[PDB]
Structure 1
């Protein structure tokens, strides 16, 4: 469940990352688009186990950022555990195009009876993180709706429990 990424600092010395301490681990809080971080596949909610061979366990957000800022040379290695708090739910649009849930400020708030969401056991009080391959974090409900409505028929959403989501952010 674990992999290494090698980040190459951009010409300004940056990697496009913000990290956050949660339950004595370190997690990706923000990934800048088109950054060294986005290029190597880092996502919101990824767990950083090691930076340059050193364990992040127990580090504060401030410390993880200081370690990155002072990291020498042009390359930074990180060992990563892929989105541990998230899960994947796959649904299909009814002949009507809906799938079957309501959401508010990025959070799933209702499941529609007898929908694909209900059949697939979609849960409320969970934030939608990505839709069919794309971060929806920080976007407006209206933009989220539009991405959902830009149909695919098959809709795969990745979700995190709201409690956790709210601590990472």
Structure 2
């Protein structure tokens, strides 16, 4: 998580899409969805990113509707955004034991217990936090089984990016749990 504000320059694709859904939260605007293979994923926009400006206009107090309408009207050629990096999230670095374990139990992407004497205990992993990313890979909407899969196939150093569940439940409200699985960019980024 950059303790960092950055500018991103976007280009609408052939269909005039950028591949973003935005959500009003506490009078900011946050990324609810980044569509795979969109302009938004190529410039590296992430779930939970705050959008401060669109074309140098402040987003403060905009409805989810108004932010979508503003995006729909922009001169497609070039859209500037000012982004604050995943402000509701933190990253935690853990090491698997020889039995392959970091030392927690999750359900529907939510950490529900921390296993005593584990790397997760030693690093202060919290319960009631949704898993947003693993080693910088978005995993939101993946079945629990494919999250554990990605953990097994991870090396011994595991980075997890988490969000308080109240905040997570507030952002994804009114996106069907199938569009989360279906269309949320779960790809490793391109270079």
Give the TM-score normalised by the residue count of structure 2.
0.87
> What are structure 2's unaligned runs of at least 5 residues?
173-191
2: CA distance, partners of 1:54 / 1:133: 29
CA drift of 1:33 comes to 1.0
CA drift of 1:146 comes to 0.4
Please tell me whether residue 82 in structure 1 is matched to residue 95 in structure 2: no
Provide, for residues 74-120 of structure 1, a one-character-per-residue CA deviation record: whole Å limited to 9, x for no partner: 11111000000000101000010011000000000100000000000
| SS of 2:137 mapped into structure 1 | coil
Please tell me whether residue 58 in structure 1 is matched to residue 61 in structure 2: yes
Provide, for residues 4-49 of structure 1, a one-character-per-residue CA deviation record: whole Å limited to 9, x for no partner: 0000110111100000000000000000111100011100000000
What does residue 166 of structure 1 align with? Answer: 169
CA drift of 1:151 comes to 2.9
* Paired residues of 2:28 and 2:51 also in contact (CA < 8 A): yes
| SS of 1:33 mapped into structure 2 | coil
From the superposition, tell whether residues 115 and 12 of structure 1 become closer, same or farther in structure 2 (CA, over 3 Å): same
1: CA distance, partners of 2:135 / 2:39: 23
| SS of 1:114 mapped into structure 2 | coil
Structure with more strand by fraction:
1
> What are structure 1's unaligned runs of at least 5 residues?
none
Aligned length: 169
CA drift of 1:73 comes to 3.5
Give the TM-score normalised by the residue count of structure 1.
0.99
RMSD: 0.6
1: CA distance, partners of 2:19 / 2:61: 22
* Paired residues of 2:16 and 2:76 also in contact (CA < 8 A): no
| SS of 1:147 mapped into structure 2 | helix
CA drift of 1:133 comes to 1.8
